[PDB]
Amino acid sequence: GADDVVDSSKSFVMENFSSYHGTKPGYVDSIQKGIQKPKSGTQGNYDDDWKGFYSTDNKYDAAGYSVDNENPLSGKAGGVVKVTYPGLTKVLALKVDNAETIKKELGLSLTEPLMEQVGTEEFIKRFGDGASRVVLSLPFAEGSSSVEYINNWEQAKALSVELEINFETRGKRGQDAMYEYMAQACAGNR
Ligand SMILES: Nc1ncnc2c1ncn2[C@@H]1O[C@H](CO)[C@@H](OP(=O)(O)OC[C@H]2O[C@@H](n3ccc(=O)[nH]c3=O)[C@H](O)[C@@H]2OP(=O)(O)O)[C@H]1O
To answer: Hey, what's the torsion of the CAs at 2, 4, 6, 10, to 10 degrees?
Structure first.
């Protein structure tokens, strides 16, 4: 039953659906060249069902992903990008963060990565209400008002990328400076 795995009151189709991704040091300027997948093993998540490009509504929540990854001792940080999907995208809010119950209640092949299947013409079509693509959605983290957007890997390519902020210039001061940034919410969510 689709109904008990997807929250319909938090799904919608949208013109130019933007979300933010956190980019590590190095990798800022090539990600503004664009999204396409990593060859170095991870590609999104440990479990196959869930590999895809991960983004969020909240740029602040995005910003703390722009840090470290073999050495937190250099206080650097890359920046945040606003990635944006051209035109018409659905966002299917899952009410269940668990893949075989997601594949079974939605009636999806019981033995694929679910993010492989979100990719198909048959999923875009069947669930996208006329959308060029579907992005899944589960919240951010416990008790947080932000959602997390799991983008399919192929449908993700066709995203475009602008710099939201870039801590990669402050080398040693990047991570410190980032706190200041994340301190704008309590001061600018208003
Ligand atoms: N041009 C590029 N195109 C595509 N991706 C690129 C590109 N260049 C660099 N990447 C990186 O490749 C991974 C793709 O998601 C991310 O790095 P990470 O350090 O593994 O990022 C670490 C983790 O943070 C997650 N994550 C990152 C940012 C964010 O906003 N939210 C989030 O959940 C990733 O899902 C990843 O999860 P897993 O470690 O569980 O794989 C990303 O920064």
So the answer is: 130
- Asked if the 1-190 domain carries CATH number 3.40.1190.20, the reply is no
Ligand 1 atom at minimal distance to the Cα of residue 51:
41
Resolution of this entry in Å?
A: 2.5
> CA torsion 29→35→40→46, rounded to 10°?
120
- State whether residue 170 is helix, strand or coil: helix
Smallest CA separation from ligand 1 atom 35, residue? 44
Pairing of the two strands 79-84 and 147-151: unpaired
Amino acid letter for position 19: S
The rounded Å distance from CA 121 to ligand 1 centre is 25
Compute φ and ψ for 14, nearest 5 degrees.
-150, 150
Report residue 41 as tokens.
């093993």
Domain ranges within the chain, ordered by starting residue: 1-190
DSSP letters spanning 87-152: SEEEEEEES---HHHHHHHHT--TTS-HHHHTTSHHHHHHHHSS-SEEEEEEESSTT-S-EEEEE-
Q: Is 27 annotated as a binding residue?
A: no
Tokens at 135, concatenated: 């992005």
